[PDB]
Amino acid sequence: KNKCVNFNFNGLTGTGVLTESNKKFLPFQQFGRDIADTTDAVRDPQTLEILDITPCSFGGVSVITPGTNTSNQVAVLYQDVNCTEVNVFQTRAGCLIGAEHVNNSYECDIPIGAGICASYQTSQSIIAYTMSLGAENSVAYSNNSIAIPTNFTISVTTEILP
Amino acid sequence: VSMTKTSVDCTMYICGDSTECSNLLLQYGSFCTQLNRALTGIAVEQDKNTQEVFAQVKQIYKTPPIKDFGGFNFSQILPDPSKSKRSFIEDLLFNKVTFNGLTVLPPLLTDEMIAQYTSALLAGTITSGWTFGAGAALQIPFAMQMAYRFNGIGVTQNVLYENQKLIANQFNSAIGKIQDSLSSTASALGKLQDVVNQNAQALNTLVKQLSSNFGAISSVLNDILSRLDPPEAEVQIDRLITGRLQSLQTYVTQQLIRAAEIRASANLAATKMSECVLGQSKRVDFCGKGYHLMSFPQSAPHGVVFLHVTY
Amino acid sequence: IANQFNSAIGKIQDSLSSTASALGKLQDVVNQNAQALNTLVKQLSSNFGAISSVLNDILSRLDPPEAEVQIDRLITGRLQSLQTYVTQQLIRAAEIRASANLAATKMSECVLGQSKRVDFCGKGYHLMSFPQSAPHGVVFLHVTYVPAQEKNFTTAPAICHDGKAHFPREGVFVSNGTHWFVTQRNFYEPQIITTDNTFVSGNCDVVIGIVNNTVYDPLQPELDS
Amino acid sequence: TDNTFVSGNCDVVIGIVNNTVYDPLQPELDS
DSSP: OOSEEOOBOSSOBOOEEEEEOOOOOOTTOOEEEOTTSOEEEEEOSSSOOEEEEEOOSOOOEEEEOOOTTTOOOOEEEESSOOSSOOOEEEOSSOEEESOEEOSSOOOOOEEEETTEEEOEEOOOEEEEEEOOOSEEEOOOOOSSOEEEEEEEEEEEEOOEEO | OOOOOEEEOTTTTTOSSOHHHHHTTSTTOSHHHHHHHHHHHHHHHHHHHHHTTSOOOSEEEOOOSOOOSTTOOOTTTSOBTTOOOBOTTHHHHHHSOOOOSEEEOOOSSOHHHHHHHHHHHHHIIIIITTSTTTSSOOOOOHHHHHHHHHHHTTOOTHHHHHSHHHHHHHHHHHHHHHHHHHHHOGGGGHHHHHHHHTTHHHHHHHHTTTTOOTTSSOSOHHHHHHHSOTTTHHHHHHHHHHHHHHHHHHHHHHHHHHHHHHHHHHHHHHHHTTTSSSSOOOSTTSSSSSOEEEEEEEEETTEEEEEEEEO | OHHHHHHHHHHHHHHHHHOSGGGHHHHHHHHHHHHHHHHHHHTTTSOTTSSOSOHHHHHTTSOTTTHHHHHHHHHHHHHHHHHHHHHHHHHHHHHHHHHHHHHHHIIIIISSSOOOOTTSSSSSEEEEEEEEEETTEEEEEEEEEEEEEEEEEEEESOEESSSSEEEESSSEEEESSSSEEEEOSSOOOOBOOBTTSEEEOSOTTTSTTOOOOOOBOTTTHHHHO | OOSOOOOSOSSSSTTOOOOOOOOTHHHHHOO
16 A cells, blocks of 8 residues: 555555545445546455545656757656655645755746746856746835925837737 | 546556556657647646646735724635635635655745735735736725725715615625535535546546457456567557547546636636736626626636625 | 937847747747647647547557447547647637737727727827837837926915915916916926916815915006007 | 816807906916
């Protein structure tokens, strides 16, 4: 048990991890299913032990890669996993292997997920950090203070629409 | 604003790690890849429709400790930093909203980052007014900022100076009526629940198609190979592949049309968070019924809650 | 203005010549269309459950009661590929058509007039817009008004000449330390407080945080002179 | 005279009435 194995009982077969459960089964039942026809629970024939059918570590493989004329260092990032079943940092989308965690918050250049982004800092290396939502600024609010602009400039922006 | 990000693989959903099932997927060419690139493009557009509406100001402003804003009570809309900064209204907005290749991934802009984006729009409209949306953060008192909103709709500023205590009781009591309405009436948040009804209820119908026979003699790939001959089981397996890919061609079509409706709503949500919030909309009945003064946006799961101030 | 506006046009030309990342709104339309056209020809090489991908190879080799089964599986497999081709292109055409309704709005309101909408003519206060030609799109040149510097001055809602409250018509009342001046929120100018710039409304016993200042009446020196 | 403005005459407006405009310049001369 407790592995990514292929279970084959007298009434149910498939592939899943037999983890511990907290439900309450009936002595004449054999297994249990989910709402939309998904087997997620099994029962031993003559042993008081309730086990679930946990799916193994699966998901897409997303690789953060730089340009072909800039750098060659990449990182390994799997989806919907942890850092135990697989520069190691755990995120909500999966385990990020190949990036050192930095407490300093910088500008989000490459998105990863759950507020975590990566950048290329000096020689270039992939880092893991929480993205910055903007520059901190405390407005001097008062009842008898105002800021009237005296100098101006002319800036022309460009917006592209199909 | 956006929807729930869910990536469904074209391999693990059709074939349950079978060798003979994957041999027929190569005969279709790039039919497996076009279903994966279509579901991946929705998650890219969900991140684009989230950042273009919420992340509009490149500077995060904080609330000053001196809360002298003309006698108003902004404690119900300010997120508490001691608790995920959530206000008194946002506590009800989060609680009243509820295998084979199904990969659920969280988005980049989580709910903890929308509270800091709305805090810059809240402190920016009060302390700096409308100057931070066009240039630098120019400070201005809130008693004189509200007098300019009356001048845009043709109202003299003498009414604000003589009814300061009258506007402090009608506005602060109107916020509590919305908080009591969302807790009692559960049908008031049906728009946020409609995003779940188009994603979670649609995912429950997708797994039930795997148990369907689809005109074949069985619904399990292991039963057809073990019973029928290997030259004879390829006909009944191909009937299951043609039926299960039709379920994927229906789920991609029904979600991409609904993704265009959220993206069309994201263009309206970005307009109501810029024209109605950061400025003063001259459009009649755009911020709701009545003469629009200002608006304060709130965070919501896969959406946004508006609080328009009407006259 | 002539030194800042002419220099802002040159920064757009230097940005387009340095890299092509500024035109990403049009390159995504071509890349999603060119890859959709090239992948459709690759579906003809697929078997689609048949023994071959060529229509002439199945008919000239198999039996005429036997080749009709493999061709019909190949035709129905190609009709599902064309069904996805019509479905994926029509939803993408509806997004450009929804963008064309937004482009028709900006070319008729922002270009042909002055709009008072925030984040509709770029970032900043809108003055004018110049459209430019583009393949399967349009390029806008939104002229914006952004301030550079500022000064912190003491403000007041109104003043009190002889007990009555004088409210400003346009702008607020600031002071450099000694005298109160009239200015707007976008440009500083030491204007003298006259009767033509304010109006009498209410009294000086209701407004909280009011100050006292003598209003310069132009009717008084014209009579004694 | 500051809250209103003079435009045209009083012989072309349909449905016009007569009144008295309190000119603030008149008590200034008599002061």
